[PDB]
């Protein structure tokens, strides 16, 4: 019911707003704080620019307790001045459970984001499906999932996991481009610990089964884990600072403080590669020499540490970095590193971010484990990602460049636009220990260098390492107007 | 030709394969590669790698453009695996073929593992464990025959139509159809063979099965209805109660995306209780890998018909070609149980009628009618046109 | 339970949903001289071709189907989608379940590109559902707008159709009502009389919309005739705006016939004597037959679909038997929308012209003959389908400009020796020297001057010569036609 008078309806609206927000927030704060968690609205407030939030569907209700908003807070705002859409589950209101009203609110802000081409950040903290709504619940899960698939590579999609996330709740995060978890308040699994322990013979805790560390290091479902909710939200904002709003519009360009000439940071790369091939180096020291301010945002820091995927800038422009890391498993490629880099590269290609590869790859990790778990069809994903991509590709060969690993890591035949090799680059069909299908020191002298590849034009230049920053910046600037045609098809058939 | 220079990859060799692949892309016809190689020609150094890469690149730019089929009829190691891995179907032959990125010499010298080539990457390994092999022939005649039969279902390319064959379906109800009224057991812990339903519906009771020895809890096959190519994805309760898991999800997911690329409609037979639980499945990444099948269904635009024979719980029901994921026609049997969960109640909710009340299902039929209604739906959907997101490509989880 | 028991349980609800519901519905509808929703679906579609969807959908008394029968089928072998309100169940009123069923049939028809036939017989909005009903009305309306010119849309009005119920029929391409059993109005006679005293038939009965308002393109004597009318109409149309129209075999005489020669005498000698333009049209079309649109509305103009050599042809022709064939508001809007529809579905336009000018008067000017008569000019100029024009007699000023003259875009314009193509008539220019087509012919504004007996023969040839016509269109979301 409503009042009749105009002033009384304005007052009545103020009362319902008071109940739906101010009251609902006080009380949610009490229940969440005793579990070390923030409220849906506190997270929205930390994520968005102050004063930018426009809340939608504040007075939506389900159709049979009927709290305003139905357990999710939705709307849009800005992050560092650029528009974004937002939803944030309220775990304290009907469990943040997936219902038709809840789901319709999330569907609307997703439709809006697709309509204007802006990113979507989902803040997840849910008790799961709303069982009393029966199959209706499933329908809306599927609706949201379908939008994720139709937004994939169109608008950036980021998932923050800041509470329970089980069952159908895992479906939308799984389809977004980045999933960010938080240290002690989040977990993630399709099937829960109690039923795993009831049908399978396994007694496991929620954190052992699908805690943050599991997905950051073992399954690879988590691209970053924040120490606290603030650290995760900050990571998300920093990531958005590298991305375009959509796959058509340009990425942001920032002012820079790049040295035009040789610096001591540049001269340090002349000694970064050890004399002995037993000794490794930290690729990060190479990467930081090239990127603006020596800084980058690392994707999957704790997953497949034998390869680095990161976003940085050169002369104020977004650049994606993929680099073999000799500090872990000698920088060989394997299943985890290949899927890690493969999806990173395909994402950057969709949103027109050029890829800067630093190569030092001795080969693949050999064992029964790798073959039986499918290194062929899963390692080939990185080949597919490189060959499919049309963004500018610049490749710096620092050391090992053996066989298929060399082929995959942004070689010129796979589509790289500029390939430079240091004199430490060893570009060969295989190492000298493997080439005894026909003394290994002699082979090492003839072929442990880039000059056969350079002689065939497979690399474009062989430079002193200190020139790297400079040449990368040149190559990048020369490639910004690149246009490359794509095969005509509904889509490819990438191995899965 | 393995007997000539080891059948090894070089610039001349490689340029010959480059020329035939360029031709096939040029006229839009399928490519069948027959592999039997000692590997890279090391005397040619990086040249060999370059050409491997060239062929790989062509495979990627042909993916979803022309059907690509790889027969592995011998050794296939190192660089040799790259092109087969990128084609759409890999067919091996027992006793004579194997595939691995790194060979046993290096596995033992680097990892301390003593394994033979056949244990490391033999046909059984790739047909049953890794999934790299979509079919393994007993002999070469059987593998070649399999490849030709497969081609008989497929269009030459992603624009031209698939072949249509002469037909012999009985116009009215048969006893094979009426047999489906009895296939679902009364007792719910008792299973049935989903293959009997599939063979009841398809022409000649026949289908060419993809990945027969891999993830047998799901069936992927090509068959025909009234002479037209139809792709079948079906839960098989004979293995793991028809549960979904990592292997089944990736198997069906790629099958569906390939069929979508070449305009083959997808007919789903649903009977899924849920997902396989365990530390194994979660830590091996069931979230991001199981979701691949959801991506495949939701992305696809070919006609999709779904027959719900029995269990239809939660996310399993969502993924298996529900209407909300994009299916154009969804019919349910009276044995269909469409609910959020099973018993985590059974009398009021163990049936298709709440989903039917919401229009989430289009149809509740006696099973003997399935073949007929499926045929009608398929024929009614051949002119389907559906728009696709504008993008270079999506960002499917890998 | 048991598997056999669930099959039997399903048989019980199926009989409950259709057979028992059908006999009660048939009773309550026969009590008003109307057939059932399912009976009409069965008269419309090919026997046994109907596939019903959403048979057990229920709202949130809960009857199966929620008061509308939805599905798809074939008409004379070609696929069509159909919905049919059941007035006896919950008033055949618009609710969310009801609405979702028609939305699904509409989505399907848009998806496969086949026509939609809606059969309307509704108590209006389901008030108990509040705004939900409006929401769903709107959904359906939007789909009509996005189907407009994409798939043929036909509305059968076979009972009450008031309030929100009028919105979707108004947006379809053809609305057909039935004598004595149907009516249409935005607001009902109750409130209309409460600000004025009127009955439903005088406010919005079929005769009103067939002759006065123009909302009804045809009125059937009974339901069977209206349905037959719709099937005959679909036999002329493509399934959608991309795929070709049906082509039938014919037995056209290859040479000049006596039927052809009868037109040499059809135009009277003295210019105050009028003729029946229909005799010319029937001389040109296959079997002397055509399907007339808006037969009782603006009868100074004829709009019809016929065939030449088995191919669909649209005919727009001035009719001197009514208002001497002048153009007016009603005739302009009728012909204009017919032409735009035919252009959307790639049906060529055959014009027969005998136009002395416009109907004069305060009535016509004050009600906007400028902005509404100009719609027909827009329709001709916008259209890109082949346009063939036969000028039988009067060809005066803007009237001649509008009916498919060559400068407005016609591809072939032939004139009889009785054609008087002039800037204005004899009385207004202050004529024996100008009462003829030859200054127009001398300028090439007409392409040929023929003896009337040649008409059919040249028309057919022109038609056959133009099937591969392509014409570029302005780059725009859409135009700004006057409304």
Numbering used by the authors:
A (entry chain A): 12 to 75, 81 to 454, 475 to 532
B (entry chain D): 106 to 449, 479 to 532
C (entry chain F): 15 to 74, 81 to 216, 219 to 452, 480 to 532
Give sentences copied directly from the paper behind this entry:
X-ray crystal structures of SamR0483 alone and in complex with hexanoyl-CoA reveal the molecular basis for medium chain acyl-CoA recognition by this unusual YCC β-subunit, prompting us to rename it medium chain acyl-CoA carboxylase beta subunit (MccB). Similar to other bacterial YCC β-subunits, MccB has 3–2 symmetry and is composed of three individual dimers that form a ring-like hexamer. Each monomer can be divided into two domains harbouring two copies of the crotonase fold that pack together in an antiparallel manner to form a dimer. Taken together, these results establish the existence of a unique YCC-dependent pathway for unusual polyketide extender unit biosynthesis.
To develop a better understanding of the molecular basis for the unique substrate specificity of the acyl-CoA carboxylase β-subunit encoded by samR0483, hereafter referred to as MccB, we solved its crystal structure to 2.45 Å. The active site of MccB is located at the dimerization interface for two opposing monomers where residues 137–237 from the N-terminus of monomer B are packed against residues 392–492 from the C-terminus of the next proximal monomer F. The individual monomers themselves superimpose well with a backbone Cα RMSD of 0.167 Å. Overall, MccB has a high degree of structural similarity to the previously solved β-subunit of propionyl-CoA carboxylase PccB from Streptomyces coelicolor21, with a Cα backbone RMSD of 0.738 Å. Consequently, the vast majority of the known substrate and cofactor binding residues of YCC β-subunits are both structurally and sequentially conserved for MccB, PccB and AccD5 from Mycobacterium tuberculosis 2122. The greatest structural deviations of MccB from previously solved structures occur near residues 33–46 and 452–477. Residues 33–46 of MccB form a long α-helix resulting in a larger cavity near the substrate binding zone. Residues 452–477 of MccB could not be modelled in the apo structure, highlighting this region's high degree of flexibility. In contrast, the region corresponding to residues 452–477 for PccB adopts a partially ordered helix–loop–helix motif. The high flexibility of MccB in the vicinity of the substrate binding pocket is consistent with its ability to bind larger acyl-CoA substrates than PccB.
